[PDB]
């Protein structure tokens, strides 16, 4: 009988026996013809029908390239449609996507490629130098999304494959599907990610209310779990438009927000500082943005004031995330369909269908409200473990299923989480 905390919302039914793709597209028929991915640079629009078909084609293509269930591909791509097709294609096969920052060094990319046992690297022509001769010696294929160099395949060999050549497969809930690194490979499963997505956007009163006429700006990098999950996956679930920006600069960012009337803005302190200093911000209609969320460190008081002055209809709020946790441990309840009050400085309320407690690090004993200790969470959304490192897993998830974040915070009288130390 510890002191356990739960969400202010009720639990919901979570269909986490479904594979990730079957869950994200479960309600595709309600929005088959709506915009799904919008490429900000060239304005190309893929509907939900196109996105699913493209992902299944990519899956058959990966199959023809020798990817079997539980094999791993690496995505070394900026935000782009191809990132999505690769990621979802690997999921259709029951295979694993490890994603990496394309601006990594050769030594960085290669170390992740070998720890993850990646059979294919999907990349841009301009980055092939970093891996081309590593790939060569270890029979790892290279596929480029813009143009193949001598010894690589062009991504059309996947996107043009026959969708009905996807092999019959028996995906299990605990099968790994996503392997971001944090450096340790964090094994996220179909069950985890479906749970995490449902805890965020499903239910009669969703913790984060998004619907199929929203436009979500996808400028935060998809190779970080924060956006992979809370923008792409959640957006797919509810049928929203995912307006992809491949790299941030302030002008096209304001341009895309006005022209596409972005309603959901996943920002980070470096973005709001660009907004603060850019003279041209006052020359754009940004009234479409109704929800702004932080994906990294908290904005602070000045940056929060910038968002309130430049985005007049934007609700502002802070969550709390960690890669091993799914990533989302807590969500801002001001974003709920039927909103709750919040408080400056708070990092949200623990997700529904989960338990949280605060563990004094000397004792090991759960703490009351308004006292600081290590944040711990438990639920189906958390990782399965670190890849090939059972010991580091055993020090991070205990025997009762509790994940120890290493962050110090407390929960106050209104079930609002406050974090006081993130430096481990
Ligand atoms: Ca065909
Ligand atoms: Ca199954």
Q: Count CB neighbours of 139 within 10 A.
A: 8
Nearest Cα to 35, choosing from 96, 104, 93, 81? 81
Known binding site for (E)-caffeoyl-AMP: residues? 226, 230, 296, 319, 323, 331, 407, 422, 424
Contact 76, 110 (CB under 8 A): no
Between the CA of 297 and the centroid of ligand 2 the distance, in Å, is: 37
Resolution of the experimentally solved model in angstroms:
2.2
Cα 138 to Cα 14: distance, rounded to the nearest angstrom: 41
In terms of DSSP bridges, do strands 241-244 and 417-421 run parallel, antiparallel, or are they unpaired? unpaired
DSSP character for 233?
I
Q: What six digits make up the tokens of 158?
A: 């996947």
In terms of DSSP bridges, do strands 215-218 and 186-189 run parallel, antiparallel, or are they unpaired? unpaired
Between the CA of 216 and the centroid of ligand 2 the distance, in Å, is: 30
DSSP character for 334?
G
Cα 7 to Cα 158: distance, rounded to the nearest angstrom: 43
Nearest Cα to 180, choosing from 55, 325, 297? 325
Between the CA of 173 and the centroid of ligand 2 the distance, in Å, is: 6
Q: So where are the chain's domains?
A: 1-424
Contact 199, 325 (CB under 8 A): no
Contact 130, 106 (CB under 8 A): yes
Contact 337, 210 (CB under 8 A): no
Q: Count CB neighbours of 201 within 10 A.
A: 23
Cα 409 to Cα 405: distance, rounded to the nearest angstrom: 10
What DSSP assignment string belongs to 106-127? HHHHHHHHHHTTEEEEEE-GGG
- For residue 316, what are the contacts with CB-CB under 8 A and spacing of at least 6? 292, 299, 304, 307, 308, 334
Q: What six digits make up the tokens of 61?
A: 């293509």
Between the CA of 405 and the centroid of ligand 2 the distance, in Å, is: 30
Ion ligand 2: residues, CB < 5 A: 171
- Classify domain 1-424 at the CATH topology level: Rossmann fold (3.40.50)
Q: What six digits make up the tokens of 230?
A: 């809370």
Nearest Cα to 330, choosing from 207, 218, 238? 207
Burial class (CB in 10 A: 0-12, 13-18, 19+), 302: exposed
Residue in the structure block whose two tokens are 């990646």: 118
Which listed ligand is nearest to 69 at the C-alpha? 2
Between the CA of 98 and the centroid of ligand 1 the distance, in Å, is: 28
* Chain-centroid distance, C-alpha 297: 16
Number of Cα atoms under 13 Å in the Cβ half of residue 85: 29
Provide the sign of the torsion angle of the four alpha carbons 194, 199, 200, 206, taken in this order. Answer: positive
Q: What six digits make up the tokens of 188?
A: 């996220």
Cα 166 to Cα 113: distance, rounded to the nearest angstrom: 25
Cα 390 to Cα 393: distance, rounded to the nearest angstrom: 5
- For residue 1, what are the contacts with CB-CB under 8 A and spacing of at least 6? none
Cα 157 to Cα 191: distance, rounded to the nearest angstrom: 30
Residue in the structure block whose two tokens are 């994940």: 403
Contact 59, 264 (CB under 8 A): no
Nearest Cα to 124, choosing from 95, 104, 97, 107? 104
Between the CA of 294 and the centroid of ligand 2 the distance, in Å, is: 34
What DSSP assignment string belongs to 258-299? HHHT--EEEE-HHHHHHHHH-GGGGGS--TT--EEEESSS--
If residue 403 lies in a helix (H) or strand (E), which one and from where to where?
strand 403-411
β-sheet bridge partners, residue 373: 409
Between the CA of 46 and the centroid of ligand 1 the distance, in Å, is: 18
Nearest Cα to 84, choosing from 262, 244, 256? 244
Method for this entry: X-ray
Nearest Cα to 350, choosing from 145, 207, 171? 207
Contact 287, 150 (CB under 8 A): no
Nearest Cα to 120, choosing from 89, 150, 146, 147? 89
- For residue 168, what are the contacts with CB-CB under 8 A and spacing of at least 6? none
Q: What six digits make up the tokens of 5?
A: 């905390």
Q: What six digits make up the tokens of 331?
A: 């969500």
Known binding site for ATP: residues? 182, 184, 318-319, 323, 407, 422
Q: What six digits make up the tokens of 23?
A: 């869950």
């Amino acid at each position: 009988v510890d002191i356990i905390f739960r969400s202010k919302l009720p639990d919901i039914y979570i269909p986490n026996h479904l594979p990730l793709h079957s869950y994200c597209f479960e309600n595709i028929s309600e929005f088959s013809s709506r915009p799904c991915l919008i490429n900000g640079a060239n304005k190309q629009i893929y509907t939900y029908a196109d996105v699913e078909l493209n992902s299944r084609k990519v899956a058959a293509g990966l199959h023809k390239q020798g990817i079997q269930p539980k094999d791993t591909i690496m995505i070394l791509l900026p935000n782009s449609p191809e990132f999505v097709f690769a990621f979802i294609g690997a999921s259709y096969l029951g295979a694993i996507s490890t994603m990496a920052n394309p601006l990594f060094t050769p030594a960085e990319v290669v170390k992740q490629a070998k720890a993850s046992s990646a059979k294919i690297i999907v990349t841009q022509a301009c980055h092939v130098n970093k891996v081309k001769d590593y790939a060569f010696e270890n029979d790892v294929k290279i596929i480029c999304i813009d143009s193949a160099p001598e010894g690589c395949l062009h991504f059309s060999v996947l996107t043009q494959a026959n969708e009905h050549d996807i092999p019959e497969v028996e995906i299990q809930p605990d099968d790994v599907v996503a392997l971001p690194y944090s450096p340790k490979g964090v094994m996220l499963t179909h069950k985890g990610l479906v749970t995490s997505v449902a805890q965020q956007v499903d239910g009669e009163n969703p913790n984060l209310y998004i619907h199929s006429e929203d436009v979500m700006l996808c400028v935060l990098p998809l190779f970080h779990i924060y956006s992979l999950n809370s923008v792409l996956l959640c957006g797919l679930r509810v049928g929203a438009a995912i307006l992809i920006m491949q790299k941030f600069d302030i002008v096209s960012f304001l341009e895309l927000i006005q022209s596409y009337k972005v309603t959901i803005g996943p920002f980070v302190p470096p973005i709001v500082l660009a907004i603060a200093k850019s003279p041209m911000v006052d020359d754009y209609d940004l009234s479409s943005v109704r929800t702004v969320m932080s994906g990294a460190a908290p904005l602070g008081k000045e940056l929060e004031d910038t968002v309130r002055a430049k985005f007049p209809n934007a609700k502002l709020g802070q969550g709390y995330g960690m890669t091993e946790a799914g990533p989302v441990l807590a969500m801002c309840l001001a974003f709920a369909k039927e909103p709750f009050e919040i408080k400056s400085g708070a990092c949200g309320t623990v997700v529904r269908n989960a338990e949280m407690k605060i563990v004094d690090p000397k004792t090991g004993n759960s703490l009351p409200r308004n006292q600081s200790g290590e944040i711990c969470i438990r639920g189906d959304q958390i990782m399965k473990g670190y890849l090939n490192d059972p010991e580091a897993t055993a020090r991070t998830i205990d025997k009762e299923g509790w994940l120890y974040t290493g962050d110090i915070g407390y929960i106050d009288d209104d079930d609002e989480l406050f974090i006081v130390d993130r430096l481990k």
